[PDB]
Amino acid sequence: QKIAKTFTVDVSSPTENGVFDPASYAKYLIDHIKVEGAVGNLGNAVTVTEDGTVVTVVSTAKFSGKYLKYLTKKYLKKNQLRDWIRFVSTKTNEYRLAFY
Amino acid sequence: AAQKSFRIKQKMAKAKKQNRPLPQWIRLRTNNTIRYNAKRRNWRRTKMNI
Amino acid sequence: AREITDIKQFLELTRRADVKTATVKINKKLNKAGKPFRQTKFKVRGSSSLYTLVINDAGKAKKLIQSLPPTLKVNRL
Amino acid sequence: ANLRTQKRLAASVVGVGKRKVWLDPNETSEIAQANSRNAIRKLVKNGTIVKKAVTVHSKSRTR
RNA sequence: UAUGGAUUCUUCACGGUAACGUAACUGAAUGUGGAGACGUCGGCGCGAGCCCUGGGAGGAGUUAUCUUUUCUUCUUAACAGCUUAUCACCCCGGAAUUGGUUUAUCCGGAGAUGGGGUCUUAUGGCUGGAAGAGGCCAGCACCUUUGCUGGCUCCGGUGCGCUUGUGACGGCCCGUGAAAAUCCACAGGAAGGAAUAGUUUUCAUGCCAGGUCGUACUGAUAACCGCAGCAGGUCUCCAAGGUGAACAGCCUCUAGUUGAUAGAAUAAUGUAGAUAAGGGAAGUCGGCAAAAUAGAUCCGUAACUUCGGGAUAAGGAUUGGCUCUAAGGGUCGGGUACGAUCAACUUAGAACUGGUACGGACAAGGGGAAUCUGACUGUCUAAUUAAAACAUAGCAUUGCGAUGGUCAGAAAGUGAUGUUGACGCAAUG
RNA sequence: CAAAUGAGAACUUUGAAGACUGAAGUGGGGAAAGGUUCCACGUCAACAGCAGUUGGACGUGGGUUAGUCGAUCCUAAGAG
RNA sequence: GGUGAACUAUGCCUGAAUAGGGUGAAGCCAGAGGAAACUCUGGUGGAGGCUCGUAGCGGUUCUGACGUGCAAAUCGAUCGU
């Protein structure tokens, strides 16, 4: 009813490869979270916090790993750094951006 | 057919055994005029129709 | 292929004189959303049937594995 | 070479069609050597033989 | 074939008013009864799978822009227990102010309604089988027929949906839609049976064995037959999305194939497919061939008729897209006349809009007035005749009462009709 | 279209593209029939009405595992 | 004197197959008119060797293709059911 689902996104590999901008990534996520069909309505429901190596998104409204991956891949396509980043989940809701 | 009888299967086995070419050494045997198997069979050419 | 209900039934089955192998399977199921518990399945293999006893109490399962005779072949996996 | 056997084996091993089985052109020699189901499974794991994705049939217009 | 269980000094069990229940709970001769065991069609109900769909957990695609997006995995066998049923049946009771009730009108003083129960287990649910399996993901030692470790595999919804199975029903017949093996049960009561032990192997557990032959593959525009790797013929099961009434017609997923000698050019004449000014059958044996018609909704529909039809008669109008409007349901109730979740596809209406187009491809009747003929449905000259020919129901005639009629056989202690009997069989028109 | 194989490639293999069958299928299986056509290796003199390195061809071999699926048992029209 | 019902004709036995529409029979329910007799209306239901039309079965016309054919009878359209 009011549980706070958390979503970890490791950004360590691209941020230490120095081709990523996790600050702008978190900005894109927070400005493009769609709640009730419109962006900008994060009424203290979906909150994005960044430390430079992990992006944590805490949600009470409708959020999903599918949406997180879809937005992340949209950002990767916009920054044309696909074939370089893969959004992959290690365990439940603790995804990671892999370079190799 | 898949569901055969043992009589039909025995005839099949005999036909498969008989269908082989001449051993090479009968040709070298003396006073021999046999050059090949003249009773050779192919499943499309001639049906044994048993 | 047959459930067991009571520990007495399990005990008569294990002394049935034709069972020699027990398999202990651990299932990490959920009873409530925030309480994933450890379920233990004691499988006694009779000649005709495979009897299985479900135990949701870890203490009960430990006392069961300790109380079964050491001559019978127990296989935990 | 002649990888008809390997294509049929890969389809039968990975449970998809020969229309989905992809065989690496650069690994023709290795695929040809691979003549058993065990070797076809080894190549599939190794990445020489890959299942092609199912061709898309969207239901967006229907929806 | 022993053990446990049940039964036994009330010898072969108890419980329930009853339908009946349970772990068992003797049962010969003989008899009897069930299952085996049965058509077809129609709607209705239920279930299985599939289809559709919401959330969530992975993977892939698209990302000039848009899309909490598109595709994709999220599975649970035989078998064992508990539970689960329309129908049926039992107990109490005693009904007109007749009530109950199906989509379908049947059922009740031969006992309805109502209350309470019993059974079949189709079928579903839970657990075991069983997550250990399968599946979807991520990572490890650097050529080498090598594995290992981590997660996840979850919770729902919907319907005149498709197909299949089942159920309770209803229609049809001068047609009423196999047999046997086999298995069980009942009636009866032969025979036998006590006590440190008898019986029960229809209760549970336990021991042993299960032979012979087939099994590969095609099953067809290349594995069969047609002289062949022949455009022919040859029985059947499963059956996704959209359009649409629709397993045709068109397009697409899974799966499969890309096979049919090729290259160049584009004369006549051909084969197949089209179009055409004005006329509109003048062509021709003859409208042959083609064209026009065509779906759906609404209106309207003649002569004649065996009252059933004719009839889609004939003949008219409409049809898109977008924005709306309205109607049509299920489940949850009552101080101390009415409310909320749950978005399901049908119908009707109104503006607005456009090169007046809109069943926009596909699909898809031409119609009318008569004459001859056969009533109709049906059948035949495989490979030149599908007809008015044959058949048909209807009508009429004929023979025959069994030691018989009609027919068969060389004969027969032989046959068909005939498992028959004049409302029949046989023979004709 | 391009690689590979090959003396030789319109026809073989692989990859890419374009297509078709479109679930009373050109899909998955069976019945009759066939009889080894199945599968692998080698190979192209003949055969596949062009070609062929390919093949249902040629040569050599491998392959069909049942108490539970059938037959086997029953009876039908009938035969005897 | 023998051999054929593997094609086909007919009977029997035992199996199997057959979208979606149109029409709308009996049976049944409600209503209206009428003094009555009765008549009429709206539903329901789902009959038929009924009908349009797939699969199937057949084979009308083109007197089309072909006619030293794919084929000793097929192919295409159009058709019957």
Q: Which two tokens stand for residue C65?
A: 């594995």
Q: How far apart are CA D24 and CA D30, in angstroms?
A: 9
Question: Is the Cβ–Cβ distance between A4 and A58 less than 8 Å?
Answer: yes
Q: How far apart are CA A36 and CA A23, in angstroms?
A: 25
Q: Which two tokens stand for residue A69?
A: 């991956």
Residue nearest to nucleotide E127 (CA to C1'): C3
d(CA A56, C1' E235) / Å: 67
B45 Cβ contacts chain F strand, under 7 Å: no
Q: Which two tokens stand for residue C68?
A: 């079964």
Beta bridge partners of A88: A96
Resolution in A: 2.7
What is the layout of strands, in order, in the sheet containing C50-55?
A: C2-4, C50-55, C39-45, C21-27, C73-76
All partners of chain C with 3 or more CB pairs under 8 angstroms: none
Q: Which nucleotide is nearest to A36 (CA to C1')?
A: E68
d(CA D60, C1' G53) / Å: 34
Q: What is the 3-state secondary structure (H, E, C) of B1-50?
A: CCCCCHHHHHHHHHHHHHCCCCCHHHHHCCCCCCCCCCCCCCCCCCCCCC
Q: Which two tokens stand for residue A11?
A: 């950004």
What type of residue sits at position A80? Q
Q: What are phi and psi of B7, to 5 degrees?
A: -65, -45
Residue C27 is inside which H or E element, if any?
strand C21-27
Q: How far apart are CA A31 and CA A25, in angstroms?
A: 10
Q: Which method was used?
A: cryo-EM
Pair type for strands A34-35 and A38-39: antiparallel
Q: How far apart are CA C67 and CA C61, in angstroms?
A: 10
Cα D40-D45-D47 angle, rounded to 5 deg:
95
Q: Which of A33, A40, A39 is nearest to A74 (CA)?
A: A33
- The number of C-alpha atoms within 13 Å of A37 and in the hemisphere containing its C-beta is 0
B38 Cβ contacts chain F strand, under 7 Å: no
Q: How far apart are CA D40 and CA D54, in angstroms?
A: 21
Q: How far apart are CA B50 and CA B6, in angstroms?
A: 13
